[PDB]
Amino acid sequence: HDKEAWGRLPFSLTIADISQDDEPLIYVNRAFEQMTGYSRSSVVGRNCRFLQGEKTDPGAVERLAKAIRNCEEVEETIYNYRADGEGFWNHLLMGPLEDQDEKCRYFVGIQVDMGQSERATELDRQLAEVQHRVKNHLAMIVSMIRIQSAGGVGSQFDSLSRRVEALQLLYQEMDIKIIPLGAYLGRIASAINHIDGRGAIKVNVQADTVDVPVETAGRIGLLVSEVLTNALQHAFSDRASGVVQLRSSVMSGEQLRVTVEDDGRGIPEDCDWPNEGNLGSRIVRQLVQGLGAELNVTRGGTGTIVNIDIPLSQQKTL
Numbered sequence: 001h002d003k004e005a006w007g008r009l010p011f012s013l014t015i016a017d018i019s020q021d022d023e024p025l026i027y028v029n030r031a032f033e034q035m036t037g038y039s040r041s042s043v044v045g046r047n048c049r050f051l052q053g054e055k056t057d058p059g060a061v062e063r064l065a066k067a068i069r070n071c072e073e074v075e076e077t078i079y080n081y082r083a084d085g086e087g088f089w090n091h092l093l094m095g096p097l098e099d100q101d102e103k104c105r106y107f108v109g110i111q112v113d114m115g116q117s118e119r120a121t122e123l124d125r126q127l128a129e130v131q132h133r134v135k136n137h138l139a140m141i142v143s144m145i146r147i148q149s150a151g152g153v154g155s156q157f158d159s160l161s162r163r164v165e166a167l168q169l170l171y172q173e174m175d176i177k178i179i180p181l182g183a184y185l186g187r188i189a190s191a192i193n194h195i196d197g198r199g200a201i202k203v204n205v206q207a208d209t210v211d212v213p214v215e216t217a218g219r220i221g222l223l224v225s226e227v228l229t230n231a232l233q234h235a236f237s238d239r240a241s242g243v244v245q246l247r248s249s250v251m252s253g254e255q256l257r258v259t260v261e262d263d264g265r266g267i268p269e270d271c272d273w274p275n276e277g278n279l280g281s282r283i284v285r286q287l288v289q290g291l292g293a294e295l296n297v298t299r300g301g302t303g304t305i306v307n308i309d310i311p312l313s314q315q316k317t318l
């Protein structure tokens with residue numbers, strides 16, 4: 001139901017505790033289960049090297065081993081084997097996760113199933129850039145938080161996994177100024193509402209047709225994800241009904257305005273979001289800064305209006 005939904009995603013993510021004997025996996029996501037044929041229950045507590053076998057290149061393995069020992073980032077395309085014995089090429093990107101405390105205790109790796117073959121396009125590099133965006137975005141999130149130390153541990157990592165959602169959706173659009181933002185936002189809103197909402201919540205989407213670069217899209221997607229999620233989660237706490245609206249309008253000078261509007265409960269007056277808040281508010285401010293954008297908010301029992309102004313003209317310069 002959600003297993004298949006969450007699983008169809010192209011990124012696969014794992015986290016290992018390299019401080020523990022034999023560097024056991026402590027977390028894997030649904031994509032990993034689908035890709036490898038192993039259940040999460042089966043895999044946690046074991047070193048990920050069970051995916052390797054006959055055709056696995058020792059050179060690549062050594063480089064992974066060296067990277068872990070040197071607390072370094074590494075990227076290899078490696079031959080791996082699923083639970084049913086099926087071989088596949090795995091494009092692996094990994095390196096130290098960086099806690100609040102230690103900078104090298106935990107490692108994260110991402111896996112992209114590249115199918116079978118027994119090469120580099122121009123799509124390949126665009127795809128690879130995304131896997132860096134994923135890892136990179138994950139790192140910023142992690143460094144703010146404090147990795148706790150089974151199910152509750154998984155919830156700390158289920159949340160992380162959830163935010164990379166804009167980027168997994170982006171990879172899919174990419175597989176098919178090159179990103180159709182309106183189309184992309186439509187899939188973002190649907191996914192979010194699918195996860196974070198239900199029945200009595202109406203989600204409207206009004207996007208102009210415009211193509212933008214990948215980096216801009218990935219950034220925008222994550223920005224909108226945070227803010228749109230906030231709407232469905234918070235705006236109707238004490239409310240029986242509501243409406244959320246996402247807009248994306250191209251204005252003059254290639255200035256793009258992205259809006260998220262509630263009619264719900266309103267942001268508390270003491271709280272000056274996103275300057276004040278939880279991890280989300282911090283995420284939003286970073287993404288806003290990387291975009292060179294401006295965010296504004298208007299409060300009250302008539303609802304919450306969020307507006308992000310993004311300069312598509314200055315992206316080249318940036």
Ligand SMILES: Nc1ncnc2c1ncn2[C@@H]1O[C@H](COP(=O)(O)OP(=O)(O)NP(=O)(O)O)[C@@H](O)[C@H]1O
Nearest residue numbers: 230231234235266267268273277278279280281304
């Ligand atoms: N649409 C909204 N309506 C009412 N209150 C809101 C709304 N959006 C945010 N808030 C308030 O702002 C606070 C900060 O939210 P935020 O920083 O995004 O973290 P969070 O939504 O609580 N969970 P997370 O964002 O995933 O870390 C929330 O706890 C709410 O009290």
Ligand SMILES: Cc1cc2nc3c(=O)[nH]c(=O)nc-3n(C[C@H](O)[C@H](O)[C@H](O)CO)c2cc1C
Nearest residue numbers: 014016047048049051052061064065107108109
């Ligand atoms: C987080 C993490 C994920 C890994 N994922 C893979 C993988 O998907 N495929 C693989 O062949 N090796 C993987 N390795 C390498 C493997 O587990 C082991 O550390 C090295 O092969 C050293 O023997 C991973 C290592 C870490 C730390």
Ligand SMILES: [Mg+2]
Nearest residue numbers: 226230280281
């Ligand atoms: Mg939030």
